[PDB]
Amino acid sequence: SIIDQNVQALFNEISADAVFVTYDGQNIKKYGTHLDRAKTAYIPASTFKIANALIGLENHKATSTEIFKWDGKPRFFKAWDKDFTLGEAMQASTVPVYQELARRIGPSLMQSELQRIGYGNMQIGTEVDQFWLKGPLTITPIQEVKFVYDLAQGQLPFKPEVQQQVKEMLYVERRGENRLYAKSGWGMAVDPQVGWYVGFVEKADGQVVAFALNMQMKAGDDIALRKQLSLDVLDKLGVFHYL
Ligand SMILES: [Cl-]
């Protein structure tokens, strides 16, 4: 399969252990340099924002139009020093906004909801605004792709409109009638560090291919690489051709 060879060559560039998983609703396929990562659990990092948003909307702790106001105290990034909706905060990965959401949900409800939907190992520990950044919550790349595949198809155990609104929070770009939805993550606070790019490509006719890049990161790594590599792979696969 020369297409597989083309994809694997993309990983020849890269010293970090990496896996790229796809799911089309029938079959799981794995690419990369360490395929066992696909069935290994890692902290979700900011990919957890998907589940956080679903849980927050489902349980009336926020709406998709509610503005989370900045209080005026400088945040870690100047990019975060503004008001955000949950969708805007999704694309900017505004951690303090989603920490506020998590505290609205609270530890009892967060724990019962993660158990209800079977998200990863469903463990949150005692800090409701830290568990996706520090652990103990972990999830495998295969679990991630099945989760977002179900989101794409509206088959998660949430209200239809809750799922649809969080789905569009993830929208990145379209090419022709093909749509890319995705969320990055970089679990820096744990060792080894984990890098994620999770999402799906939707065609006009409704067909969906979900994907997850999962790779080892280290201090000083290029922040843009997760998305770039994922787009390069999706193009080589013909799932999301470059225009
Ligand atoms: Cl990120």
Count CB neighbours of 94 within 10 A: 24
Residues annotated within the binding site are 46, 49, 93, 184, 186, 226
How many angstroms is it from 46 CA to the middle of ligand 1? 6
Beta bridge partners of 197: 184, 213
d(CA 22, CA 7): 13
| Under 8 Å between Cβ of 216 and 3 | no
Host domain of residue 138: 1-243
How many angstroms is it from 136 CA to the middle of ligand 1? 18
Q: Could you give the C-alpha distances from 221 to 67, 77, 158, 160, 226, in angstroms and in order?
A: 33, 18, 36, 38, 10
d(CA 80, CA 76): 7
| Under 8 Å between Cβ of 87 and 96 | no
Q: Which two tokens stand for residue 232?
A: 């390069």
Axis-axis angle for helices 95-105, 107-117 (nearest 10): 90
Q: Which two tokens stand for residue 87?
A: 């969708």
Q: Closest by alpha carbon to 143, among 122, 127, 126, 164?
A: 122
- Structure determined by: X-ray
Q: Which two tokens stand for residue 210?
A: 């979900």
d(CA 188, CA 168): 27
Backbone angles phi, psi at 211, to 5 degrees: -145, 160
Domain count, the chain: 1
Give 58-63's long-range contacts (Cβ < 8 A, gap of 24+).
58/113, 58/158, 58/159, 58/162, 59/105, 59/109, 59/113, 61/101, 61/104, 61/105, 62/86, 62/101, 62/104
Q: Is the peptide bond before 107 cis (omega within 30 degrees of 0)?
A: no
Count CB neighbours of 101 within 10 A: 23
| Under 8 Å between Cβ of 152 and 181 | yes
How many angstroms is it from 117 CA to the middle of ligand 1? 24
What resolution in angstroms does the PDB record give? 1.3
Looking up residue 96, the CATH number of its domain turns out to be 3.40.710.10
Residues annotated within the binding site for a beta-lactam are 46, 49, 93, 184, 186, 226
Per-residue DSSP letters for 183-242?
A: EEEEE-SSSSEEEEEEEEEE-TTS-EEEEEEEEEE-TT--TTHHHHHHHHHHHHHTSS--
- Catalytic residue list: 46
How many angstroms is it from 11 CA to the middle of ligand 1? 20
Q: Could you give the C-alpha distances from 8 to 14, 19, 39, 136, in angstroms and in order?
A: 10, 10, 19, 32
- Which residue shows structure tokens 């506020």? 100
Diameter of the chain measured on Cα atoms = 55
